[PDB]
Amino acid sequence: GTTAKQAEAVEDSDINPWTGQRHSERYFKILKARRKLPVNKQRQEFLDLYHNNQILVFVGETGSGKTTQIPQYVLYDELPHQTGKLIACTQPRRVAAMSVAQRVADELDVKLGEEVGYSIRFENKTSSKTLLKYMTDGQLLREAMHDRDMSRYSCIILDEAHERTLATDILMALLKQLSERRKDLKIIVMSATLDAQKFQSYFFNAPLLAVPGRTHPVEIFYTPEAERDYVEAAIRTVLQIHACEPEGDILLFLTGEEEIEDACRRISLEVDEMIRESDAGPMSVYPLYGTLPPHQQQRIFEKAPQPFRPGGRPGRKCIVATNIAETGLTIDGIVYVVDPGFSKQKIYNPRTRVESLLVSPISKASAQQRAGRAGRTRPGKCFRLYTEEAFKKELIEQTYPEILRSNLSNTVLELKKLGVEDLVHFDLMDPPAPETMMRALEELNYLACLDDDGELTPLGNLASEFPLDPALAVMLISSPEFYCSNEILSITSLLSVPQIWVRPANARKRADEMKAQFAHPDGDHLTLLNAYHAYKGAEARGEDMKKWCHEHFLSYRHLSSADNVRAQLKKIMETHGIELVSTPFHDKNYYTNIRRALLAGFFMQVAMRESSNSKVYKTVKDEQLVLIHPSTTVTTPYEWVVYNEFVLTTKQYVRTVTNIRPEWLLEIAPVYYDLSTFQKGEIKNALTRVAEKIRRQQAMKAS
Ligand SMILES: Nc1ncnc2c1ncn2[C@@H]1O[C@H](COP(=O)(O)OP(=O)(O)O)[C@@H](O)[C@H]1O
Ligand code: BEF
Ligand SMILES: [Cl-]
Ligand SMILES: [Mg+2]
């Protein structure tokens, strides 16, 4: 029963209890400011709730001291038990876990990597001396794959569960099960914008600890009129702050990497025309996105420029960022936050099995977390570029969970690697529908990624290593047996992105003209492969590919993404010892090999023509009646086709269609097309005739 005042006396000591060295003067200056935080008045109320409850819910305002102080409150309590375990705190972003770990190491007067450290995907800045670890939720989930009981941690702190990521929602379900299995494990879930009663009721009616109060206020300013060009409204507001507001840096939130790098250039050019004319101060402009290098990512903590003259307008720092800085980070010197209200949120197309990023409105919880990046070290204000009534009535309260916006079949294979056995009764906080979960289990069993008992096959474990929809990964893994593994490697990448065709309403004719350069009459998949080959062909000549894709009416963003995916997918097969073969182009079976190899992943998406009079096709799965989509490069479709996408519109269509032979269905997928147990119907009768026709064909040639 170690009290808070007992621990404060150790914090006030000259000697570091963790290292045995003398405390620095910087440590005491930080500790004096740490105790003015709103969580410090309730340190004993926290310890009373922590000793008596296994799972704890913590809420407090942005900047209260949740991330920085509570693991140190736990660390002072947990060391006398001599467990040899560690304290784990999860942040959803890599830069947030790195920056906080350097802060808490400074707060504890230790060197980063020793008693306090971080662990991310490709860096583990820990050691034997490490006691507190600030990791990501994905990195803790990767350790849960090899250690399902998490035997290395005595306390798990799930910081910022409000973002509801894929790793966080899974970790909440895993730790809730582990709470019944392990009673020597403590679980803390904390956030500032949280459905606390929902998180309470999920964790076996756990207690709640509410901390009121802010360190510094944040004034919320709204625009009276809606402005559509949010980039123009953002750049206008940043220049207005540098002109007419006192000293203090700006944090700008925009959606994508290309959006801010244009905006970082447009701001710096309009700043330089404010310097020469309006006699304002200098402005440093810094970008921040996820694909940016870390040594340039750490430049956002770089000091504001000084003014040109003593007594002049203040020099300023503008950080234009994505929502990578929405949570967790405390950037010193930020006074102003501009909120356009948009972010790139992951969506899932169920017909094409593609996870893509869409610019969408942020939630109410994201706006408060964005405004909470100020008001931490000094008072601040947030400029929301939207109506107050748009905040109250148009914005949703909580961000939609990532597990409902992701590929469920990819999620299921990761959960089997985590040790989950009952998937339909897995207690997620917001689970998918049981029709949706069983459909993922139905497809993954037919793809041989799961057996009939439901356990993970070695095909499913290997398909989980690829960042693809699992039907595309089975197609890539089976590709060397069809002698077209270099070609399927490109086709899976183009099928993992949205459609590359650009058909504007003002230029339909010129769009179809450039598309017909790549058109293959046997399949749309070969038309995709031809267009990617033309992209990589003009790239080797030295042409401007943005100019090339615009003139050839192709999406540059989707084609360049598939080229980066194909480089990723090519490396995964090389490290796993998979052959990478291709047939020469003038082989008689070059194109038939590629059309055969599509059925290794897409045997379930097959249509059969009903009658010779009709253009209506009937699908194998669920007997749907479809037409061929008019975007097809197939001039005359066969009686049997494979398709990538079911299209529901005023008429039911199938898109990305390739002609196949029905005898390939029995060869490639015999378990699904087992005619012993197949469903009665016209497709079965047509398939048994195909098996009989090749039977009388081969037997008479044996005669
Ligand atoms: N790098 C830093 N530099 C200066 N002050 C910091 C830093 N990190 C945190 N702080 C201070 O500690 C407070 C608590 O931060 P934190 O614990 O992350 O807040 P929250 O509880 O909102 O997650 C901040 O409001 C700020 O006053
Ligand atoms: F809630 Be805090 F801004 F991490
Ligand atoms: Cl997201
Ligand atoms: Mg925090």
Numbering used by the authors: 60 to 762
Could you give the paper's own sentences about this structure?
A structural analysis revealed that a serine in motif V is involved in polar interactions with one of the ligands in all structurally characterized catalytic states. Since mainly the mainchain of the motif V serine interacts via water-mediated hydrogen bonds with the adenosine nucleotides, we tested if a higher flexibility of the mainchain at this position has an effect on catalysis. We could furthermore structurally characterize Prp22-S837A in the adenosine nucleotide-free but RNA-bound state, as well as Prp43-S387A and Prp43-S387G in the ATP-bound state. Since Prp22 could not be crystallized in the presence of an ATP-analog, an existing crystallization condition for ADP-BeF3−-bound Prp43 was used to structurally characterize motif V serine mutants of a DEAH-box ATPase in this state. The structures of these three mutants show that motif V is able to adopt the same nucleotide-specific conformations regardless of the side chain property. In the ADP/ATP-bound structures, the mainchain of this residue interacts via hydrogen-bonds with conserved water molecules constituting the active site. The interactions in the ATP-bound state force the serine mainchain to adopt an unfavored conformation, enabling the mainchain nitrogen to hydrogen bond with the catalytic water. Instead, the mainchain is sufficient for sensing the adenosine nucleotide state at the active site and this sensing function is sensitive to the flexibility of the mainchain. While the ATP binding is improved at maximum flexibility (glycine), the sensing function is completely abolished at minimum flexibility (proline). The lack of a side chain at this residue position in motif V of other SF2 members is in agreement with the findings that it is dispensable for the function.
DEAH-box adenosine triphosphatases (ATPases) play a crucial role in the spliceosome-mediated excision of pre-mRNA introns. The catalytic activation, the catalysis itself as well as the final disassembly steps are driven by so-called DEAH-box helicases. They all belong to the helicase superfamily 2 (SF2) and share at least eight conserved sequence motifs (motifs I, Ia, Ib, II, III, IV, V and VI) spread over two RecA-like domains that together form the helicase core. Two RecA-like domains, referred to as RecA1 and RecA2, build up the helicase core. The RecA2 domain contains an anti-parallel β-hairpin present in all DExH-box helicases, which protrudes out of the RecA2 domain thereby contacting the C-terminal domains. These domains are divided in three distinct domains, namely the winged-helix (WH), the helix-bundle (HB) and the oligonucleotide-binding (OB) domain.
